[PDB]
Design a binder for this molecule. Structure first.
Ligand SMILES: Cc1cccc(CNC(=O)N2CCC[C@H](C(N)=O)C2)c1
Ligand SMILES: [Zn+2]
Length: 139
């Protein structure tokens, strides 16, 4: 679990979005596993606008932060799950690091701000949905 709170937006994994997220929908994209809903309170976070390929993520299944080197956002095949059929997930960044399904929502940050959130993983890999391209989150 986890979310990004920036301005009057809440960014969550689309597969973990609540009934309240969908009732306050701003934008969603199944191919990216992202959903953004509107909030009444002003958020605590800021979004990186950069091309970093290193950062630090929070891993809930270890209660720890780990440093990572990750690939640029790309189209990567993701096997079928309970949430989606087998498909290519877009804007995904992969890195070597521990992850389990409930780690989804953990934030990846670089020195410039929030980069993305855990979305995929397994076998010593962790995948992050990028949010740096969503310029409208800042306005
Ligand atoms: C995070 C993680 C770590 C170890 C193992 C896994 C395995 N489950 C998944 O790959 N997904 C379930 C949730 C949605 C995912 C998606 N973005 O399509 C797919 C996932
Ligand atoms: Zn950066």
């Amino acid at each position: 679990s986890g979310a990004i709170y920036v301005g009057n937006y809440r960014v969550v994994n689309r597969h973990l979005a609540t009934h309240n997220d969908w009732a306050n929908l701003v934008w969603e994209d199944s191919s990216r596993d992202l959903l953004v809903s509107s909030t009444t309170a002003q958020g605590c976070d800021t979004i990186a606008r950069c091309d970093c390929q290193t950062g630090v993520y929070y891993c809930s299944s270890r209660r720890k932060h780990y440093p990572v080197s990750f690939s640029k956002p790309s189209l990567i095949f993701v096997e079928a799950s309970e949430y989606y059929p087998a498909r290519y997930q877009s804007h995904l960044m992969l890195a070597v690091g521990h992850s389990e399904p409930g780690d989804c929502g953990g934030i990846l940050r670089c020195q410039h701000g929030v980069v993305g959130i855990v979305s995929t993983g397994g076998n010593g890999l962790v995948g992050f949905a990028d949010v740096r391209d969503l310029l409208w989150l800042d306005e």
